[PDB]
Amino acid sequence: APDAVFGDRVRRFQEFLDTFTSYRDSVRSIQVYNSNNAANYNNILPHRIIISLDDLREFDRSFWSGILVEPAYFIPPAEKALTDLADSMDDVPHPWKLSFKGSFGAHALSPRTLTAQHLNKLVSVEGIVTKTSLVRPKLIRSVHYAAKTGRFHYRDYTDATTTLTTRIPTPAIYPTEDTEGNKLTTEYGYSTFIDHQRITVQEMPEMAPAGQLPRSIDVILDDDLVDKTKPGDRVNVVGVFKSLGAGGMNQSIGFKTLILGNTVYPLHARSTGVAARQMLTDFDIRNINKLSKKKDIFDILSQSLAPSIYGHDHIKKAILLMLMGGVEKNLENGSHLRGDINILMVGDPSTAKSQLLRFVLNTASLAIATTGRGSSGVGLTAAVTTDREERRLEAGAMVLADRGVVCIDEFDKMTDVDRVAIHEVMEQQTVTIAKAGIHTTLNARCSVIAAANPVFGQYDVNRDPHQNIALPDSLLSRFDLLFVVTDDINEIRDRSISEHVLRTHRYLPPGYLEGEPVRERLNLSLAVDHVFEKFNPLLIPKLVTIPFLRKYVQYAKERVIPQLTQEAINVIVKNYTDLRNDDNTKKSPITARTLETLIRLATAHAKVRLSKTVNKVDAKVAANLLRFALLGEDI
Amino acid sequence: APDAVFGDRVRRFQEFLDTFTSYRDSVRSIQVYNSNNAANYNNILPHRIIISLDDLREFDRSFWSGILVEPAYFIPPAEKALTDLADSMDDVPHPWKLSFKGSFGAHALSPRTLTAQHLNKLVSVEGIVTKTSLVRPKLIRSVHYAAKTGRFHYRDYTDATTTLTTRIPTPAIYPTEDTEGNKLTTEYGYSTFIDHQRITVQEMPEMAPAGQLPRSIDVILDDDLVDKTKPGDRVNVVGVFKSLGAGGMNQSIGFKTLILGNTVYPLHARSTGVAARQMLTDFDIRNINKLSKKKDIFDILSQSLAPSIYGHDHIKKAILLMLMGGVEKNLENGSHLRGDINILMVGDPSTAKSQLLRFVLNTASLAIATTGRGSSGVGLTAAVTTDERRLEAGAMVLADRGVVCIDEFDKMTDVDRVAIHEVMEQQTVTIAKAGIHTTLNARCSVIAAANPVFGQYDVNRDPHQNIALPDSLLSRFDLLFVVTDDINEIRDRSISEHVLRTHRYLPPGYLEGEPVRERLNLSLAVDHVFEKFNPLLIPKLVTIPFLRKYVQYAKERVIPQLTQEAINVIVKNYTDLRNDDNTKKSPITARTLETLIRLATAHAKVRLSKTVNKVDAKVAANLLRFALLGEDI
Amino acid sequence: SAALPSIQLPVDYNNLFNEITDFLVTFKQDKGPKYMAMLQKVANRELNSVIIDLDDILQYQNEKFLQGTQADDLVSAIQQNANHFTELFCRAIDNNMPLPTKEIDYKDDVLDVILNQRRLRNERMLSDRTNEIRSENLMNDALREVVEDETELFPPNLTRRYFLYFKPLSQNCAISSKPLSVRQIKGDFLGQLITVRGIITRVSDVKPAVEVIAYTCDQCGYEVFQEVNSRTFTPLSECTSEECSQNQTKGQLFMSTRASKFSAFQECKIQELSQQVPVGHIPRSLNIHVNGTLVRSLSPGDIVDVTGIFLPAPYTGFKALKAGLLTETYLEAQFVRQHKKKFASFSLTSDVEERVMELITSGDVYNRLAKSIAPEIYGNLDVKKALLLLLVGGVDKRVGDGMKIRGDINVCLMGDPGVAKSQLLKAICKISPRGVYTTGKGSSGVGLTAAVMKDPVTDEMILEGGALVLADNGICCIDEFDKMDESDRTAIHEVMEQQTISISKAGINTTLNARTSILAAANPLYGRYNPRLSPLDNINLPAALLSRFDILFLMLDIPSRDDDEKLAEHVTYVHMHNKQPDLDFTPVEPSKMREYIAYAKTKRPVMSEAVNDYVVQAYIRLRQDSKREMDSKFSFGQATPRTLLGIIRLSQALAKLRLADMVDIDDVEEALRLVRVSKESLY
Numbered sequence A: 001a002p003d004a005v006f007g008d009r010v011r012r013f014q015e016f017l018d019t020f021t022s023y024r025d026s027v028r029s030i031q032v033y034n035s036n037n038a039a040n041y042n043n044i045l046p047h048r049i050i051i052s053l054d055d056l057r058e059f060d061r062s063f064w065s066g067i068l069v070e071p072a073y074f075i076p077p078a079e080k081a082l083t084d085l086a087d088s089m090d091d092v093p094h095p096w097k098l099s100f101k102g103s104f105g106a107h108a109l110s111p112r113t114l115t116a117q118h119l120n121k122l123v124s125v126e127g128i129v130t131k132t133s134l135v136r137p138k139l140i141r142s143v144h145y146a147a148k149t150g151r152f153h154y155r156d157y158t159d160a161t162t163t164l165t166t167r168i169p170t171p172a173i174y175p176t177e178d179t180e181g182n183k184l185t186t187e188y189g190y191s192t193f194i195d196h197q198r199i200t201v202q203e204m205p206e207m208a209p210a211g212q213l214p215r216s217i218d219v220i221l222d223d224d225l226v227d228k229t230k231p232g233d234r235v236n237v238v239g240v241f242k243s244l245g246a247g248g249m250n251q252s253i254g255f256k257t258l259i260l261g262n263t264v265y266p267l268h269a270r271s272t273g274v275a276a277r278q279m280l281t282d283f284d285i286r287n288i289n290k291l292s293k294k295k296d297i298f299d300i301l302s303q304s305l306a307p308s309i310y311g312h313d314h315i316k317k318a319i320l321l322m323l324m325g326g327v328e329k330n331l332e333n334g335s336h337l338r339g340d341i342n343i344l345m346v347g348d349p350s351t352a353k354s355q356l357l358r359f360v361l362n363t364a365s366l367a368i369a370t371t372g373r374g375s376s377g378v379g380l381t382a383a384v385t386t387d388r389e390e391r392r393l394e395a396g397a398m399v400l401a402d403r404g405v406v407c408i409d410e411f412d413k414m415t416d417v418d419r420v421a422i423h424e425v426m427e428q429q430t431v432t433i434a435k436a437g438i439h440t441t442l443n444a445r446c447s448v449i450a451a452a453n454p455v456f457g458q459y460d461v462n463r464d465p466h467q468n469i470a471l472p473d474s475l476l477s478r479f480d481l482l483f484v485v486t487d488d489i490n491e492i493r494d495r496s497i498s499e500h501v502l503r504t505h506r507y508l509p510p511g512y513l514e515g516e517p518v519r520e521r522l523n524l525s526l527a528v529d530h531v532f533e534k535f536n537p538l539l540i541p542k543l544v545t546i547p548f549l550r551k552y553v554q555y556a557k558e559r560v561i562p563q564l565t566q567e568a569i570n571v572i573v574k575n576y577t578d579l580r581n582d583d584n585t586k587k588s589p590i591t592a593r594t595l596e597t598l599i600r601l602a603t604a605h606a607k608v609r610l611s612k613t614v615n616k617v618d619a620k621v622a623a624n625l626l627r628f629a630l631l632g633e634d635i
Numbered sequence B: 001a002p003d004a005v006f007g008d009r010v011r012r013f014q015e016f017l018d019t020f021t022s023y024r025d026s027v028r029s030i031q032v033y034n035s036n037n038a039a040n041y042n043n044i045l046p047h048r049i050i051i052s053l054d055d056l057r058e059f060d061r062s063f064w065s066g067i068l069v070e071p072a073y074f075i076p077p078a079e080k081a082l083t084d085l086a087d088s089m090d091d092v093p094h095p096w097k098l099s100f101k102g103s104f105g106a107h108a109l110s111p112r113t114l115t116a117q118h119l120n121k122l123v124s125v126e127g128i129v130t131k132t133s134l135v136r137p138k139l140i141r142s143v144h145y146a147a148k149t150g151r152f153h154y155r156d157y158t159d160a161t162t163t164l165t166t167r168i169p170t171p172a173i174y175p176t177e178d179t180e181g182n183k184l185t186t187e188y189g190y191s192t193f194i195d196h197q198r199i200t201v202q203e204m205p206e207m208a209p210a211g212q213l214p215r216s217i218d219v220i221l222d223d224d225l226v227d228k229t230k231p232g233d234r235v236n237v238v239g240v241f242k243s244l245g246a247g248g249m250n251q252s253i254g255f256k257t258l259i260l261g262n263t264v265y266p267l268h269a270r271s272t273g274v275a276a277r278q279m280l281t282d283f284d285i286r287n288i289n290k291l292s293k294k295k296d297i298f299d300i301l302s303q304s305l306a307p308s309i310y311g312h313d314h315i316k317k318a319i320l321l322m323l324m325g326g327v328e329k330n331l332e333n334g335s336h337l338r339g340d341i342n343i344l345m346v347g348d349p350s351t352a353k354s355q356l357l358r359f360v361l362n363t364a365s366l367a368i369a370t371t372g373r374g375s376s377g378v379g380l381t382a383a384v385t386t387d388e389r390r391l392e393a394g395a396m397v398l399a400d401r402g403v404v405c406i407d408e409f410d411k412m413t414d415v416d417r418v419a420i421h422e423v424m425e426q427q428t429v430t431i432a433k434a435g436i437h438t439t440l441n442a443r444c445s446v447i448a449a450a451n452p453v454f455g456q457y458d459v460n461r462d463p464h465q466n467i468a469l470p471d472s473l474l475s476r477f478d479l480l481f482v483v484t485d486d487i488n489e490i491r492d493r494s495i496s497e498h499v500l501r502t503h504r505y506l507p508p509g510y511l512e513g514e515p516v517r518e519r520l521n522l523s524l525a526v527d528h529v530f531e532k533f534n535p536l537l538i539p540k541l542v543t544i545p546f547l548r549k550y551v552q553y554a555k556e557r558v559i560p561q562l563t564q565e566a567i568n569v570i571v572k573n574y575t576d577l578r579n580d581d582n583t584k585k586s587p588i589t590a591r592t593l594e595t596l597i598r599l600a601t602a603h604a605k606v607r608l609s610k611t612v613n614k615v616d617a618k619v620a621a622n623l624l625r626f627a628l629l630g631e632d633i
Numbered sequence C: 001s002a003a004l005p006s007i008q009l010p011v012d013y014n015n016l017f018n019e020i021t022d023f024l025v026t027f028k029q030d031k032g033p034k035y036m037a038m039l040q041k042v043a044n045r046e047l048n049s050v051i052i053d054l055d056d057i058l059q060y061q062n063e064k065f066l067q068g069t070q071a072d073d074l075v076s077a078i079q080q081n082a083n084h085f086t087e088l089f090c091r092a093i094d095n096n097m098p099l100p101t102k103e104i105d106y107k108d109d110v111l112d113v114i115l116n117q118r119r120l121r122n123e124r125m126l127s128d129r130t131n132e133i134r135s136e137n138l139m140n141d142a143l144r145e146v147v148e149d150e151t152e153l154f155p156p157n158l159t160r161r162y163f164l165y166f167k168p169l170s171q172n173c174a175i176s177s178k179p180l181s182v183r184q185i186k187g188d189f190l191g192q193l194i195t196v197r198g199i200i201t202r203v204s205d206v207k208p209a210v211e212v213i214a215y216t217c218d219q220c221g222y223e224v225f226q227e228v229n230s231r232t233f234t235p236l237s238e239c240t241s242e243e244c245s246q247n248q249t250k251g252q253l254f255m256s257t258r259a260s261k262f263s264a265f266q267e268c269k270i271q272e273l274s275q276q277v278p279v280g281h282i283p284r285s286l287n288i289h290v291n292g293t294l295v296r297s298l299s300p301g302d303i304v305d306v307t308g309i310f311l312p313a314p315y316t317g318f319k320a321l322k323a324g325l326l327t328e329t330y331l332e333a334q335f336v337r338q339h340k341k342k343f344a345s346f347s348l349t350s351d352v353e354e355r356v357m358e359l360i361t362s363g364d365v366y367n368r369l370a371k372s373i374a375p376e377i378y379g380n381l382d383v384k385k386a387l388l389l390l391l392v393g394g395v396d397k398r399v400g401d402g403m404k405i406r407g408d409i410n411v412c413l414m415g416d417p418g419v420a421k422s423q424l425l426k427a428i429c430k431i432s433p434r435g436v437y438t439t440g441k442g443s444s445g446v447g448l449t450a451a452v453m454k455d456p457v458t459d460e461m462i463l464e465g466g467a468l469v470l471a472d473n474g475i476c477c478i479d480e481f482d483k484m485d486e487s488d489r490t491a492i493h494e495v496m497e498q499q500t501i502s503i504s505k506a507g508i509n510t511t512l513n514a515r516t517s518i519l520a521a522a523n524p525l526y527g528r529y530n531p532r533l534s535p536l537d538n539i540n541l542p543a544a545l546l547s548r549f550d551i552l553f554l555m556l557d558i559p560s561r562d563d564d565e566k567l568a569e570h571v572t573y574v575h576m577h578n579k580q581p582d583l584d585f586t587p588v589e590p591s592k593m594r595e596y597i598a599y600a601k602t603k604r605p606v607m608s609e610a611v612n613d614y615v616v617q618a619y620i621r622l623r624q625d626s627k628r629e630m631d632s633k634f635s636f637g638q639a640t641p642r643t644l645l646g647i648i649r650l651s652q653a654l655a656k657l658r659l660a661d662m663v664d665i666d667d668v669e670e671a672l673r674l675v676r677v678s679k680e681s682l683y
Ligand SMILES: Nc1ncnc2c1ncn2[C@@H]1O[C@H](COP(=O)(O)OP(=O)(O)O)[C@@H](O)[C@H]1O
Pocket: A308, A309, A310, A311, A348, A349, A350, A351, A352, A353, A354, A355, A356, A497, A500, A501
């Protein structure tokens, strides 16, 4: 039966939608995209929309408060309003659903603070996904065919979790036979099945109370929201905190509670599998294109990687090339050629190697940080968990770092057995299980960066590098660039270091006082003012802001796919032959991996310059980096 | 829960309605009439339409057989289609209901033949209405008001009768409190109520077997169908023969069976309460006016009444005037003046007095036939039931605006005539008996027949001894005729040829020796002008249904008024009738003056004249003189 | 009809049924109509499978559309509601079933004789009822319907023996054509006909699944059949036939396994490939219910495109997690296409004969096939020849006494880091139809254990095979051999020699059968080879293990200004164009490689007196030479009786490559050349 208050709320929400034409434009974009993809074939984009709760609160405080604290009565009117708006807009010949973003005030919670006095309210819980039930479709309407009468019959189905309002519980039995008594045959493919997935969100360990058992809450995701995340992610699941069941009051201890999902936001956090994408405005793309024209673009970018750290410019250039990466090559026969470059730093203590690793973790889109032995060989790669609910596979560090970076620290302390398992991931970029009857080849296309002090604490010039490094020759071969750094007591260099350090420690953030302690920011970025930074610890180049550098890397990796040229090929071949057939007691062994890393470094430099082809200058720069790494020559 | 079969039936009926545009035009007329009625205020026709089932059978045999056999699955789709058509037509910013006319084949039954095999089938039953329940409202929607919130809440009710298909039984709980516990104040005047009436139809006495108990069926009427019948009417109710209730199958001898009402037709019959209205086409109206322009229109019409009856021309003219009737005067202060002509026929045996009465019974718009001793003063006037103490309308009350044909008036008891006095003169029936003080209204004109007291009218004695009736009663009768069967060779011969010609009459399509079959002739209440065969063998004789049409048109359309030339003629005629002694068959009172005025008005009606002229007064005076003096010019 | 509404659906089933019958009767462009011929074949009990090709249906539709007659998209309708069309097609087959042309003999199987008995009994019942009603004395045109109404006969489903399967429309015709990953099998595709592409991990044993269970009630002499359409069911107690339910007689009914209907059933489990898995996720699996004659067409480790019907099943998990009518899903297999054809399934059909002889006429098949494998790798040609010999394999000898010789080659690829050993192993994995790429340590520890576990489907305690068993009749492609635990090397000993794995641990007392050819890539002791140390001290293999390797390459990296730039130019060309540099060379496609190698495997060449005399002389000189310098800095151990046997195996496989069916001197000379040049890279 029609309700007047329902229609009033529908009208109010239609007025809100007409007020903020952004949502109407977004709906039109959805519909035109679906129609175009239908016409192209003679990915359908889902029937959903995002509502800025701040905009709604500005428009109508009553409606905003109603959705926030009385969602079961306010959301369905708004969804119906959206559906009517879509139907009216779709002049071209399954209701739409809402999604919410904005500030939820006191309702922004975590699975520990999710108490009963938030029930039946729209909440925005944040945590780490720990379990994801496999997507099991749900039967909402079953179509049957009657052989005798030759007509199709249907019945609709529903449950408690489908509807925000409590529809009158009606038993849902399956129509075995028709009213006249004829036999009925189920018609799959005409019946409508909808997806359904139960995921469990646990409080994030980054803010969970240490030493106490965790708290978990179940989330029921349906339709477009299924398979949105995987275990080990960080999510911001906003939805209605429904409470279900009889609570045991019916004569058969508490009420079962769960969150009906409206929106799922995978959140980027350091050393997590969720990649950190960023929005590129036309202004940002224009700035990137203009800045790529400069001849000193490589130097300008490289200086910006670690402004805090003095010197190590070649290491910074190598790190930037790693962030850009190379192009992996796949051939018809099935062979896969590595397109990722690995960097190893070996040097004296307090040489800022761990600082560089931490920055790489803090600036890459997808980076995973591990220590020496805390992440064992089982911790790296992957291994079977032998879960009783059977023989599941759990992805270790490197599998979770696919298309990303792994920042291994204290590589020297690693167990020999642990470093045995790393060879295949380094070179073939795959992890083969072949264990317990499970034969699987996980994809691990990760770039590895490691820091490790020499065995004798400080690098020994008197001893040969083979004695100091003590790493297996194969492992050193797999590492593209093997930097051997030292803490050399030089008056000018050391006093410059002191100048830089004291300049860095004398920094006051703009929104701060003198004695005001700096407040830690978790900075859980969500996976979805000038270019240059005025502050500079090192003085006169132009240093770019770290977020702008992230935008530049994100643009360059996707847009540009460089290809080699004969001119660059000749230079690469000459450098490779000269390295192989000249003996200058190089730090690393010289093999075909050196040729491969020359190619990859040239490709990375080409990507930095946003060039569709690899040129001579890229080859020269790559050769210079390699010679600096091995011989130490610097021009 | 939209259904494909329902939608297909709906679109099929919409195609049917589009094919036969007459129903569309009728719906448009109903809509524009209602809009115009609302316009005058800055009656309401019901949202119903009559469907000719014959046209549906022609257009779509399958859908027709579906309506007749299983109306539950077919009538609602048709009603939805009609509602959609009405909404689409009503572009100007309560569903429509559907009604049926036509042939029902083997489903046209009587209450005796409503066997269970006809259940769930559209039946057309015919019978007599015995009991009618009071028209009660039925609650279908109840609007409530929450004092605190200030929002009006409503609920919709239903029951098995109001819908054809069996719905899931939801108990009717009156909302006393809001969903949040707030008190609710019921809002009468905003909630919707539907009139509901149950009538019982019993087998028609004319067709019922004699000496056996009658059989009856119950009819449930709703909304606009309520109070369309009077107890004792003959009706043709058509509707679904639904069966209701668990019928004892559920643990506490058959099933409650009743005819849900779709349409009710008051069937006119001989000597019943329902009148017979004849549809007047523009062709009929033009013919009526053209014939009215004729000079001897009165003679033509009067000779057309009983062609099979020779002579009695003046009696026929009097009967024609009685059928036409005079105008009724209700003065401003409140007084009442009778406007009907009563006729009394006193004569010897076999002078055709009864056959004329039977003709009047068969041809008047509303006539009731009674005999003298069989029908008492309880039969006439009205009676109290004492069952609580309800009034049973008698013969004279039922015949309001009609004619009462009493036979064997001489035989009827003196107490009965004492009762009939007031009805004949004041045209009211007063009860004031057993604590029931009401004045029933019976404005009827009486025609009667009586034998003379000595078996035959012996002219040797005075008229008083032959008539043997109270003087006041004879004063009531406007025209008193005495007919004597006197032997005359020329008249006897002419009567013989006339009667013989009547006996050797052949129907249009019957064989010479074929037996003629009678028919009940149950006309439905709502070919040329003249008649091919004239038994008296030139003055044209009009066809008797055309005469009924003429009488109806004259009675409805024309209301004559007296004029000075007439006044003078009537005054002089009354004066010289009163002051001259000629041994009149009746005494002269002011009632004779009223009779002269009434006959003049009736004659003016016959000519379709808005005024009474000298010729009408002359005709009235001559007719009254023939009645009283027994002589004419 | 309030409870169950109706829908106007575009599809009509009677017109489609008539179209199906017409297509079955009059399709012959592929000696009469193809499917009528197949039905005639099935009637004679020669064939028990009917495969309806959707490509044939599309061709029939198209040809009927050119002439003018409108034909509904029957192929599209099958692609949308395939399950109903199986019933439509089986009814059509029953309506057009030809009469058998040969009667029932004693050699025929039990199901055929039971079905023939059922058909004869049905005909006898119908004829008896017709005779009775004719004698009642009340034309056969009217009588047939009356008799059919009044008769109680054996239904068509219990009187048919053929199994019916579809075949997806081929991709070359331009939704069933497109192979879908497991992740892309959403709830939208339920009920359709889809093709899933992925690896097969677990296949259950073939067990009898009940379709209809037959009970016998001897009191009334009626056979009552209860259909079973779930994982479980319930037997009966009262004969539900007409008499026992009607009369006061209450007949006891008993099951009859032989009279009941069964079907070969297998609950396989397909898994997502590494290419289909998105970035950062792990592969997920989908269950396959292989039924009917299609059983044993899927084995673990196969890479297939199974086409089937994505049907739902009632939820089977815990009831608390249930929220609404949740459905578990599976895929009822219809057609199986193997990406890599098995060696044991090679038939020299005329077409395979022509592709093969075209390879023969190319000339120098040995060298072309050797250079063909992994063209992106330059300058390592002897190793490619050795790997080709490994693929071909020698000849297994089982003398009448009982001695069995291995007949397979075990190659090792010891060498310096960065000489593309792992890429050679991965290439071999690509060409080889079956082979596990076992690598490293720790993972191998349980990949060779082969312990015991309970199968969910049948509750059988099936042993689980490790990597080596899964690589039966394949190539084990063990990578990083030197860095792998000694415990597994102990098993590798027996696998290489006896071709079987003997396990006598707690709970298991069997001897597994693992006929495998092992390819091993490893680095020498101390990583890069040190020329100063002796090869045996630097290879680090014990004399027992090294003896089992037929060829042990050295693949030492020795820089040179010429070869280095050759390799650099080759690699730069490979990077700048995704193709091997050699313009004039033609790298054979891997399918043709497999086909020729498979033809070669069928041949089993034998030896000639001159050949074995030359081999004996070679063995004598090799033994004496090995003894002479067994204590030198250029020693390679001491030749063993196996060393000749290896020579024999290489010569036999080389003969197989020429398909000579008899070994010549040139084969032995080439084999000795390979064995000698396997160690010439250290100079
Ligand atoms: N070249 C440098 N420029 C700036 N700070 C430096 C430099 N070298 C070392 N430091 C500082 O010294 C400390 C040690 O750096 P860290 O990365 O922990 O050293 P390690 O190489 O032992 O891991 C840090 O606080 C870092 O900021």
